[PDB]
């Protein structure tokens, strides 16, 4: 027989009937062809188990994942990996879009820190993409009054009524005259991708001494943060500078390239988190090496 599966993208939703023997590879390919997306390697189908995200493996049966079996079996089609340079690597317009949406959401949900002024400029572009050029005759007062525009963190740092923000944003919106949709979303991407937290996968760890720290994985390398400060890593290890990383019983070891360097060792208590880090390290490292050829 078959089961139903729900695939949620940032944009939309879709349903599929799947044979009981279907693997990750089968769903993934199906979703990608539907989207007409060829740049598939930034993506993956994720689901959350316990409090940890999980990505469907290609060669395992879908149902052999510890995912809630209550039909429809739901997966989110999200980006697993970020390019080092959006404008250069996101060739297909559909790839651009999906990234844009997913990034804007992380900015509004405050998963990515974003200074007040950047939040405004971003908004003015998010607005241009959704609305097209600004027509003063068409776009009248309060035409943005029901729109998530800025992170809450930003709104309550100022003595400003929502209408004033919307006036600020409109002022910059007007400057984006003549800018096509994909032009705007990419402007958004170009700004957002310089945000210090953009594209960084955080994890709680602690070192040999047992003091609590944060691990950060992204397109550039592995990073170590003081739990209070996520903007600036205390230590960075670029991919080209790492021989490899080893995992062994809730312990990782970053084995640097220069034998000169001391190894870096840290601990994480959750197994599921650990597999995730390991996947993320491998894939980010791969893509990094691929760019360099």
């Amino acid at each position: 027989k078959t089961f139903t599966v729900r695939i949620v993208t940032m944009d939309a939703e879709m349903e599929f009937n799947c044979e009981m023997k279907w693997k990750g590879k089968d769903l993934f390919d199906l979703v990608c062809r539907t989207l007409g997306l060829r740049e598939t390697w930034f993506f993956g189908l994720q689901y959350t188990i316990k409090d940890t995200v999980a990505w469907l493996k290609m060669d395992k049966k879908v149902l052999d994942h510890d995912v809630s079996k209550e039909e429809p079996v739901t997966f989110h089609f999200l980006a697993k990996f970020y390019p080092e340079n959006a404008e250069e690597e996101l060739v297909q317009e559909i790839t651009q879009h999906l990234f844009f949406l997913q990034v804007k959401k992380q900015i509004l949900d405050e998963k990515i820190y974003c200074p007040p002024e950047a939040s405004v400029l971003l908004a003015s572009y998010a607005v241009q993409a959704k609305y097209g050029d600004y027509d003063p005759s068409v776009h009248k007062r309060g035409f943005l009054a029901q729109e998530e525009l800025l992170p809450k963190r930003v709104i309550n740092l100022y003595q400003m009524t929502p209408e004033m923000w919307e006036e600020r944003i409109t002022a910059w919106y007007a400057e984006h005259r003549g800018r096509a949709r994909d032009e705007a979303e990419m402007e958004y991407l170009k700004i957002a991708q310089d945000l210090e937290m953009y594209g960084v996968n955080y994890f709680a760890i602690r070192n040999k001494k047992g003091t609590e720290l944060l691990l950060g994985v992204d397109a550039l390398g592995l990073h170590i943060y003081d739990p209070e400060n996520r903007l600036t890593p205390k230590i960075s290890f670029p991919w080209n500078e790492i021989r490899n990383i080893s995992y062994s019983d809730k312990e990782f070891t970053i084995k640097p390239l220069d034998k000169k360097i001391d190894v870096f060792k840290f601990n994480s208590s959750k197994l599921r988190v650990n597999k995730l880090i390991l996947q993320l390290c491998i894939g980010n490292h791969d893509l990094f090496m691929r760019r360099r050829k």
């Binding site: 002024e117 405004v120 740092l157 100022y158 003595q159």
Partner: peptide, 20 residues
């Protein structure tokens, strides 16, 4: 980068209304 100036102009105009 090329947004330095827009970011600065924006930051400067918000500054008067920042929380005490």
């Amino acid at each position: 980068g090329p947004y330095q100036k827009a970011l600065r102009e924006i930051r400067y105009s918000l500054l008067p209304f920042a929380n005490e």
